[PDB]
Amino acid sequence: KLEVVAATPTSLLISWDAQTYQMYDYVSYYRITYGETGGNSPVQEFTVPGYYSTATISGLKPGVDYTITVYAEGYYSSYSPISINYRT
Amino acid sequence: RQWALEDFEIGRPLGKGKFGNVYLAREKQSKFILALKVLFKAQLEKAGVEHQLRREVEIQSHLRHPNILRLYGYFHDATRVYLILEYAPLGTVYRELQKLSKFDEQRTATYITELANALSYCHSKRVIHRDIKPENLLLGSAGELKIADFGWSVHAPSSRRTTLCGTLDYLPPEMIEGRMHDEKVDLWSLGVLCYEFLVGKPPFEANTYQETYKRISRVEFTFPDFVTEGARDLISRLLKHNPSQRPMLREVLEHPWITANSSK
Ligand SMILES: CO[C@@H](C(=O)N1Cc2[nH]nc(NC(=O)c3ccc(N4CCN(C)CC4)cc3)c2C1)c1ccccc1
C-alpha cells in the first residue's frame, strides 16, 4: 500500500498513490508519522496538504529500522492507517 | 467544519452548470453572502468527471489569493455535491468579452497583471491550472479577475504530467506533441488569452480540431494591424514553442507593455 520510492541514508521519498479513497470523500491533509521501529521514542510527525501524492522525510539516522505511517484525513472521514518499514 | 445544507440560506439561481446550478447563498451564522454550486451525482458519474471533482476540491481548498475564487468547503448528500464558493457579482470575463467584442490595452494589461499574480501564487505551490480561458474567469465586486474551475489543475510533484488536458484553443504545443509538461503551460495559455482579449478570437482558430492542433504545434498565428508593438512582443514571448524560452511570471509583470498599461 505505502511505498518507498527513493532512498538516502538521511532521507526517504514515500508515495501513497495506491491508496484509493471513497467516491465524493476528498482528502484535506495527511498525517505522516515516522520513528524507530519497536522503540519507545515519541515519533516525529508532520502534515502535507491533501492533494499530495508523495512526501520527503529528511533528517533521519542511517542504518536504522524506521516505521513510516500515513493517516489519510479527509474532510468528512478518517481513513485506516497504512504503514511500511524501511531501513535507512 | 461539517458543512451541511441546513447551514445556508439559499436564494435565486446565479447561473447554470453542466451538472447542476449555482445559487446565491448566505451563511446563517455570519450572514455572509456566498455561492452554492449544486452537482448532481447521477449527471457526474454519467460524464465520468468524478476524478476532476476530487482534484478541484482537494487543490482549490488550499488556495488563498485575491485573484483566485475561494473554495471555503464542500459537502454532499445521497444525490448531489455542494461546493461553498466565493461570490463573484460581476460575472464571467467571457460575457464581458461577448459584449465589448474586444478589450482595450488598459483593461487587458490589468487582467494579465492580476492573472500573473495568481499564477505566481499557484506556481509557488507547484500547482498548475492547465485551463486558463475567459470562460473560467470571474469578476469581483471591484472588477478584479478571479480564476475558477480547478478540475484540470495538477500538483506537479504528485503527477507525471504526460496526459493532454484543457480546452482546444488553449492547449500548449508540448501537450499536442505528447511531451512532459510543467508550469510553462500556464504561460502559453496566458499568451493565448492575451491575444483573445485584444483581438476577440483565439490565435489558432480553425474549423476542425485537426487544423487547430496543427496550427498550435507549428505556432501558426498572425496579429491584426491594430495590435501594438508592445502587445505583440509579450504574446510572442509567451507563445514560444520551447517551454524553456517562455518568460517567468515575474518578468511578465515587469514587461514594458504591462508596466505602461496595467492599472494594478
Ligand atoms: C458553473 O460554475 C460556475 C461557478 O462555479 N461559480 C462560482 C461562483 N461564484 N460567483 C459566481 N457568479 C455567478 O455565477 C454570476 C453569474 C452571472 C452574473 N451576472 C449576470 C447578470 N448580469 C446583469 C450581472 C452579472 C453574476 C454572477 C459563480 C459561478 C462558473 C461559471 C463561470 C466560470 C467559472 C465558474
Residue numbers in the entry:
A (entry chain B): 9 to 96
B (entry chain A): 126 to 389
Paper text:
Double-drugging via active and allosteric sites is a recently developed approach to overcome these obstacles. Both kinases participate in various cellular pathways, and their dysregulation results in a multitude of cancers, such as breast cancer and leukemia. We find that both orthosteric and allosteric ligands exhibit preferred binding to the active or inactive states and that cooperativity occurs by shifting this active–inactive conformational equilibrium through long-range allosteric networks that are encoded for natural regulation of those kinases.
Aligning with our hypothesis, we find that the binding affinity of activating monobody (Mb1) to AurA weakens 16-fold when AurA is presaturated with danusertib. Thus, we reason that this 16-fold negative cooperativity for Mb1 binding arises from a conformational equilibrium shift of AurA to the inactive state induced by danusertib. Our crystal structures and ITC experiments showed that danusertib can bind to both the AurA-Mb2 and AurA-Mb1 complexes. Thus, we propose that the K162-E181 salt bridge in AurA-Mb1 must be broken for danusertib binding, as reflected by the lowered binding enthalpy. To confirm that apo AurA-Mb1 complex establishes the K162-E181 salt bridge, we deleted danusertib from the structure of AurA-danusertib-Mb1 and carried out molecular dynamics simulations in triplicate. We observed that K162-E181 indeed forms this salt bridge on average 80.8% in a 10 ns simulation.
